[PDB]
Design a protein around this ligand. Structure first.
Ligand SMILES: [Ca+2]
Ligand SMILES: [Ca+2]
Ligand SMILES: [Ca+2]
Length: 172
């Protein structure tokens, strides 16, 4: 995924008289865990081409409590991946955030390094959950970066996926 400038600093103010969007969201997985014996255990990513989701975008709606809700409306939000268990089994997994709806804490006055987005998405007839932890904000450009963790059910396996993300926020 893209990265922020070395000098990225400061919060990104949100003007309540304006509306905003996520123009781009990129998820780069660093971690695929598969449940075995009730434990999420690590696997090796075997797919050597791009495994990121990117170009994800959509409105940021304002709720009555001042939180923002991201409604995913487009993007490369689905990627088939193959991982390999320690014992050698190669499992195809579906990495996705399709139909993501994720909200911040209340009373949004600015996007900061303590902003979180939490919500749910659809994986071919079941729900997944995801948390985005913003870790860095460029207040000048609207670029943000952080880490994510999702849980879902792809191909008869309960799967956790973790990694890094980049996004850009801008007025509508
Ligand atoms: Ca453990
Ligand atoms: Ca453990
Ligand atoms: Ca944070």
């Amino acid at each position: 995924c893209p990265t922020l400038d070395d000098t990225a600093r400061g919060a990104y103010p949100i003007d309540s008289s304006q509306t905003y969007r996520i123009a781009r969201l990129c998820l780069q997985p660093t971690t695929f865990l598969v449940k075995e014996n009730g434990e999420f255990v690590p696997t090796k990513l075997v797919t050597r081409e791009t495994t990121s989701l990117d170009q994800i975008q959509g409105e940021l709606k304002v709720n009555s409590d001042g939180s923002l809700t991201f409604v995913e409306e487009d993007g490369i939000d689905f990627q088939p991946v193959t991982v390999q268990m320690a014992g050698g089994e190669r499992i195809p997994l579906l990495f996705t955030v399709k139909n993501l709806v994720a909200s911040t804490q209340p009373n949004v006055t600015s996007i900061t390094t303590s902003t979180d987005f939490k919500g749910e998405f659809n994986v071919n007839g079941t729900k997944g959950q995801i948390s985005l932890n913003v870790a860095k904000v460029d207040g000048r450009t609207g670029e943000i970066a952080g880490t994510f963790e999702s849980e879902q059910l792809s191909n008869g396996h309960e799967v956790k996926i973790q990694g890094v993300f980049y996004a850009s926020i801008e007025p509508a």
